[PDB]
Coordinates of C-alpha atoms and ligand atoms in Angstrom, one line a residue:
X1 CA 143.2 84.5 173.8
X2 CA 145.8 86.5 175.1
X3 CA 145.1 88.5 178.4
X4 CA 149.3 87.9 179.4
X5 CA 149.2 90.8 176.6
X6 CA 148.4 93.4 179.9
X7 CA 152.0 92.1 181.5
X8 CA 154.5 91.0 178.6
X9 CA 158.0 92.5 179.4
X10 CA 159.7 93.2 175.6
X11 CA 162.8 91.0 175.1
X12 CA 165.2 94.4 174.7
X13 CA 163.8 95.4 177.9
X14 CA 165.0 92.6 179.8
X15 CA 168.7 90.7 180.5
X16 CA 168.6 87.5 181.9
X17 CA 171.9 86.9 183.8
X18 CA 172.4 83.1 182.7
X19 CA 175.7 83.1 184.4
X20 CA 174.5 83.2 188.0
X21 CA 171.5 80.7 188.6
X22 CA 169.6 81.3 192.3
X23 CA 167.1 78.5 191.7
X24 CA 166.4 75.4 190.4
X25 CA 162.7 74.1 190.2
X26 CA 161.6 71.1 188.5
X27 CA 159.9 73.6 185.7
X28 CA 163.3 75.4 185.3
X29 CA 166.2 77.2 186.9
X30 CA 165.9 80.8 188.4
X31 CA 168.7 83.1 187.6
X32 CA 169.4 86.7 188.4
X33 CA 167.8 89.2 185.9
X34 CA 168.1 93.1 184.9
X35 CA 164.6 94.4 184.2
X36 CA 164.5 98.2 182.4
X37 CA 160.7 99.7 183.9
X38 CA 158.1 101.7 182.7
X39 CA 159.6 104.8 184.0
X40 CA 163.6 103.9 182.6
X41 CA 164.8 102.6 186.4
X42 CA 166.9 99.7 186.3
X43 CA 165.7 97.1 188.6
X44 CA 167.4 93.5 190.2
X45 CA 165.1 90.8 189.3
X46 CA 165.0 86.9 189.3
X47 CA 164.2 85.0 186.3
X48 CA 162.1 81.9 186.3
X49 CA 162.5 79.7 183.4
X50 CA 160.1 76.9 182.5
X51 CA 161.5 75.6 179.4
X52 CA 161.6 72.1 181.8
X53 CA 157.9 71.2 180.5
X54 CA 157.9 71.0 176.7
X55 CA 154.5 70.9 175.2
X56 CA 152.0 73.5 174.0
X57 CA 148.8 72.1 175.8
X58 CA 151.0 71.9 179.1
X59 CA 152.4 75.4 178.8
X60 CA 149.1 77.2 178.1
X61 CA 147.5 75.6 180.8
X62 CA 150.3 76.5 183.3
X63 CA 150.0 80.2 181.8
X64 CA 146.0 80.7 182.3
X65 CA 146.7 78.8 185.6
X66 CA 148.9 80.9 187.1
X67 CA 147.7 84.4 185.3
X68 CA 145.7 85.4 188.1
X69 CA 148.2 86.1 190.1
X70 CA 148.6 89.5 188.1
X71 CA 145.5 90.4 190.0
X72 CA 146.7 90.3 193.3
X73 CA 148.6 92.7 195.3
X74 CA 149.5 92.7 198.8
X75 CA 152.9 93.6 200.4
X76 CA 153.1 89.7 202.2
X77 CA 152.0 88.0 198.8
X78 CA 154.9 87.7 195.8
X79 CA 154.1 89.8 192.5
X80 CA 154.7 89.3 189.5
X81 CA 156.4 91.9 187.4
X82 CA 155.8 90.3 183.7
X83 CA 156.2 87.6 181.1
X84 CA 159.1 87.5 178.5
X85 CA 158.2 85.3 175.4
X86 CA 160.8 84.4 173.1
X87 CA 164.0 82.1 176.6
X88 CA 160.9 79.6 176.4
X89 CA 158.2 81.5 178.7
X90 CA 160.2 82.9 181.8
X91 CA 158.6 84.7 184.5
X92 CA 160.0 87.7 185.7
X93 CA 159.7 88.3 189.7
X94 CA 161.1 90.9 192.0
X95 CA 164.6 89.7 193.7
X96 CA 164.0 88.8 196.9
X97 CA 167.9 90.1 198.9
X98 CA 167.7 87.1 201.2
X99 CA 166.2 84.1 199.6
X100 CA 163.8 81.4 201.2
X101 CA 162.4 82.2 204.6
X102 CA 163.7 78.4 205.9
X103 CA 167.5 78.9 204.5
X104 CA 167.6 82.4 205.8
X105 CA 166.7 81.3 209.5
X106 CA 168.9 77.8 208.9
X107 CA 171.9 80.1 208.9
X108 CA 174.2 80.5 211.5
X109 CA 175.6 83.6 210.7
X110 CA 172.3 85.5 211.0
X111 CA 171.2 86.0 214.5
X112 CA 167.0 86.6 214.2
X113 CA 165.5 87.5 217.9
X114 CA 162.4 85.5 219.0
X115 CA 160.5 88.6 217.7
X116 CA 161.6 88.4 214.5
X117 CA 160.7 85.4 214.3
X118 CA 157.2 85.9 215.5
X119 CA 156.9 88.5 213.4
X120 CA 158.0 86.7 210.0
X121 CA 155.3 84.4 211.0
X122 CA 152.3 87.1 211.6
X123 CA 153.8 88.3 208.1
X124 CA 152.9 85.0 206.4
X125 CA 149.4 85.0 208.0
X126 CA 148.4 88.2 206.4
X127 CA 150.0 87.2 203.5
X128 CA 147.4 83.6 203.8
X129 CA 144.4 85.9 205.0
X130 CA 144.6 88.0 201.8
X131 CA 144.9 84.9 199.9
X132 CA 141.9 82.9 201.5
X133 CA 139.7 86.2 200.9
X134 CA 140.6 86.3 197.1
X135 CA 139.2 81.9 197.8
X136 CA 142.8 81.1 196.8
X137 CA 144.0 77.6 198.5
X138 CA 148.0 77.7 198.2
X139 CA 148.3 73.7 199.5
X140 CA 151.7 73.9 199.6
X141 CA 152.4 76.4 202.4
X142 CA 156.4 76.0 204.0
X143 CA 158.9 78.3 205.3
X144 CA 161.1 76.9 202.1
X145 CA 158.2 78.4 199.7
X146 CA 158.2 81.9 201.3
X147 CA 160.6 84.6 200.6
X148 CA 162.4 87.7 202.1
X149 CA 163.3 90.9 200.8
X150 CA 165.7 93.7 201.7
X151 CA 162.8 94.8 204.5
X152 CA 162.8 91.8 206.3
X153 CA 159.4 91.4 204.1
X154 CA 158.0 88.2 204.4
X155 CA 156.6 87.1 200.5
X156 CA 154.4 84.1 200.7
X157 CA 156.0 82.7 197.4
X158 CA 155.1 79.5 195.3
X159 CA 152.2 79.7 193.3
X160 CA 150.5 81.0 190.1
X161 CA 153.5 81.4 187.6
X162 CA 156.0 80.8 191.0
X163 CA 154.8 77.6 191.3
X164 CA 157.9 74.9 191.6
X165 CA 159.6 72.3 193.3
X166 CA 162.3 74.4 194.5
X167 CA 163.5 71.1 197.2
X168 CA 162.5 67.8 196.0
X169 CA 163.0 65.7 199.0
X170 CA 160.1 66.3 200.7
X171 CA 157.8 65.6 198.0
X172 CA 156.3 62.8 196.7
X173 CA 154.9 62.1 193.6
X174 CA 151.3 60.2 193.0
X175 CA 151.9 57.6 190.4
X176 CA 148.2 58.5 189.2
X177 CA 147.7 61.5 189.3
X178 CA 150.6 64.3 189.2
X179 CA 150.2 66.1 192.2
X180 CA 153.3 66.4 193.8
X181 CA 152.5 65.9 197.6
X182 CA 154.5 68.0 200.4
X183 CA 154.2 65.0 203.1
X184 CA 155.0 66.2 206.3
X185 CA 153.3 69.7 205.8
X186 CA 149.9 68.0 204.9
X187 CA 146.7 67.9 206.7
X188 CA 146.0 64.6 208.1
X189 CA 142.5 65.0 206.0
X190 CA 145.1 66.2 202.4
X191 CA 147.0 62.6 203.2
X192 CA 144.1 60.9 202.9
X193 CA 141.7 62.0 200.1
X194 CA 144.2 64.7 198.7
X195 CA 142.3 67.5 198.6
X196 CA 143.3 71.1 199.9
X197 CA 141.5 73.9 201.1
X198 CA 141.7 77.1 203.0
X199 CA 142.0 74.6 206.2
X200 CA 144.5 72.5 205.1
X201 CA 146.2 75.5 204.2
X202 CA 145.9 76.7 208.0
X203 CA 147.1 73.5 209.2
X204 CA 150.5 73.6 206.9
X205 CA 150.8 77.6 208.6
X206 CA 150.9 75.2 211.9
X207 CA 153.9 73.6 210.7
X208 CA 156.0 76.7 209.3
X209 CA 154.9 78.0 212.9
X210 CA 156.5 75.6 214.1
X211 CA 159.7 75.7 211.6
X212 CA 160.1 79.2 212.5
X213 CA 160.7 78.9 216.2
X214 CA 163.0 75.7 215.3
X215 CA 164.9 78.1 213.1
X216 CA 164.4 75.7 210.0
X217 CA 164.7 72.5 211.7
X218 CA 162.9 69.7 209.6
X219 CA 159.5 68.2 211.4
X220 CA 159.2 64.9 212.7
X221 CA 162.6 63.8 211.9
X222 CA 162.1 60.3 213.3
X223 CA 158.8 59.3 211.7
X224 CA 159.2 57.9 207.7
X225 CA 156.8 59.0 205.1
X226 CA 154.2 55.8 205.6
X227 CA 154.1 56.2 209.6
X228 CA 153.0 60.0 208.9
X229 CA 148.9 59.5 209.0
X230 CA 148.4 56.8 211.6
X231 CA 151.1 59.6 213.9
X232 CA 148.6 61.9 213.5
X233 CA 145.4 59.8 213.9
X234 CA 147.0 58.6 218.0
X235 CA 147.2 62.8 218.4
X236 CA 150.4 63.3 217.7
X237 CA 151.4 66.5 216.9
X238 CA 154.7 68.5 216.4
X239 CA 156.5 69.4 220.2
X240 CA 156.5 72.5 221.2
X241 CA 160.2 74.4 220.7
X242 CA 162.4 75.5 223.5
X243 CA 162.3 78.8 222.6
X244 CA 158.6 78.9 221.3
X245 CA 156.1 80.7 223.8
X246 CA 153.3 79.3 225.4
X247 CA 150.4 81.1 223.7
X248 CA 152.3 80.9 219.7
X249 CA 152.4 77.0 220.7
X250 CA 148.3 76.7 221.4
X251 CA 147.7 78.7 218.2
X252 CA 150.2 75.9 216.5
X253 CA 148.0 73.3 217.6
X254 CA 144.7 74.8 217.1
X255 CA 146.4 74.8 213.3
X256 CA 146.6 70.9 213.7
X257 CA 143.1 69.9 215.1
X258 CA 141.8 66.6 213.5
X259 CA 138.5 68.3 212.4
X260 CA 139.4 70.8 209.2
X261 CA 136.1 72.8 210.2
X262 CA 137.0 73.2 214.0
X263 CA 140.8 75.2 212.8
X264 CA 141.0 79.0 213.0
X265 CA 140.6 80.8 210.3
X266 CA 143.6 83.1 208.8
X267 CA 141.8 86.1 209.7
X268 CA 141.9 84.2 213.4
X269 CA 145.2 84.0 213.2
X270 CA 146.2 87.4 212.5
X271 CA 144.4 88.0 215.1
X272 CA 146.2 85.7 218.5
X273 CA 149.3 86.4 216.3
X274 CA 149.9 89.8 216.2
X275 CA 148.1 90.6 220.0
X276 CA 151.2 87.7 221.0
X277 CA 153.7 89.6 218.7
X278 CA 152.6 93.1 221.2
X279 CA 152.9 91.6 223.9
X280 CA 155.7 90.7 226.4
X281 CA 157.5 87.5 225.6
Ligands
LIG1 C1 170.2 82.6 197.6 N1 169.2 83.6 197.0 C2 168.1 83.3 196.4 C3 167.5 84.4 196.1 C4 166.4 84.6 195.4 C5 165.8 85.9 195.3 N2 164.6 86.1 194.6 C6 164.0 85.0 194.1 C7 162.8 85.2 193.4 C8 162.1 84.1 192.9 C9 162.6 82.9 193.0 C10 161.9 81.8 192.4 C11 160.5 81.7 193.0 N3 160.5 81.0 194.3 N4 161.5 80.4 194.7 C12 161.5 79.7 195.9 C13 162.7 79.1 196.4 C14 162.5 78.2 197.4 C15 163.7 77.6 197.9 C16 164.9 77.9 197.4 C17 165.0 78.8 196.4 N5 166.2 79.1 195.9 O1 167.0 78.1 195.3 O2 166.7 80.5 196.0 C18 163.9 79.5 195.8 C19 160.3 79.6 196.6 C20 159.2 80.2 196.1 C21 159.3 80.9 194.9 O3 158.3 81.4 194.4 C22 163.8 82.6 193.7 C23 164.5 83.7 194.2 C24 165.7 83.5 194.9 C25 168.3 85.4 196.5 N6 169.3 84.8 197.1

């Protein structure tokens, strides 16, 4: 069965630039790519090998896994522009000009307004409400998984065929089973039975909220990987920024309630987000 048929990219019609890598998952690097279109345009592209996970049964199942995301399409949700086969399965994605959401905001030399960053996060919640109508759960929702193009576009990134470890030190790995485990972006229900859904995903949106107004600045620096859950289960939560308004802070802890049914939904969210993005700051 071959439905990646409908989105193979032809090896002349593709240069992989393996000199300059922008990327490196656990699956493979990324690197910076020249794509030839339907039409003859020349396009800048990124190149995600997977050539790291070396077995047929494991490849297929990543492929027919991740396939689906051919079917989407919404202007705050990554596409995918093909699959080369040769060179061991890459995946060709459009080049976003300024990375990661989290390392764009980390640097200095870029000044974004409080606006901008309300609005990158009203980008990612229409990105997540398109996502939670198609029933797709991303479960591992960060500002370091999201991207940004050359129009300040905010591309919820990471999954289907994007799917990666792109920065392994806030993972951890079940010795069991495989999942890898983003620990401090986890609802307190995902640390404890390790299941996602569309709520858990609404709870991690709390916490790139609340990286966003930071400017990057990692979450609960001062409580270790163990202390996480019984943190949460006193009512915890994540402080609200200096610079974070009053009404974005109550939508970041309606993201973080105990009960996964009582959260807002994205839809919600979109909602209080983009009526606090009109309105004066
Ligand atoms: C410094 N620069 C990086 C890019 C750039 C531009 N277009 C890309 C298109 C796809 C991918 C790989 C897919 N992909 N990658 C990340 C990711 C996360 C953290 C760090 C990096 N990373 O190391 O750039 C990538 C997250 C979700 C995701 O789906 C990486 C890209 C990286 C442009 N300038």
């Amino acid at each position: 069965v071959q439905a990646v048929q409908h989105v193979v990219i032809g090896p002349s019609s593709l240069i992989v630039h393996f000199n300059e890598v922008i990327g490196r998952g656990h699956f493979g690097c990324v690197y910076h790519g020249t794509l030839l279109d339907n039409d003859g345009k020349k396009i800048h592209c990124a190149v995600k090998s997977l050539n790291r996970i070396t077995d047929i049964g494991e490849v297929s199942q990543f492929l027919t896994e991740g396939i689906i995301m051919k079917d989407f399409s919404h202007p705050n949700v990554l596409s995918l522009l093909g699959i080369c086969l040769r060179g061991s399965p890459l995946v060709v994605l459009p080049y976003m000009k300024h990375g990661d959401l989290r390392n764009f905001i980390r640097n200095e030399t870029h000044n974004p307004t409080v606006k901008d960053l309300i609005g990158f996060g009203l980008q990612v919640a229409k990105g997540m409400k398109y996502l939670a109508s198609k029933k797709f759960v991303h479960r591992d929702l960060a500002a370091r998984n999201c991207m940004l193009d050359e129009k300040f576009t905010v591309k919820v990134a990471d999954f289907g065929l994007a799917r990666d470890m792109y920065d392994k030190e806030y993972y951890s790995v079940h010795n069991k089973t495989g999942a890898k485990l983003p620990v401090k972006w986890m609802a307190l229900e995902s640390l404890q039975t390790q299941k996602f859904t569309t709520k858990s995903d609404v709870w991690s949106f709390g916490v790139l909220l609340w990286e966003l107004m930071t400017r990057g600045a990692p979450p609960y620096p001062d409580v270790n990987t163990f202390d996480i859950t019984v943190y949460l289960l006193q009512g915890r939560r994540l402080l609200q920024p200096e610079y974070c308004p009053d009404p974005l802070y109550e939508v970041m802890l309606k993201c973080w309630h105990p009960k996964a049914e009582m959260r807002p939904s994205f839809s919600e969210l979109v909602s209080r987000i983009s009526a606090i993005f009109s309105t004066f700051i």
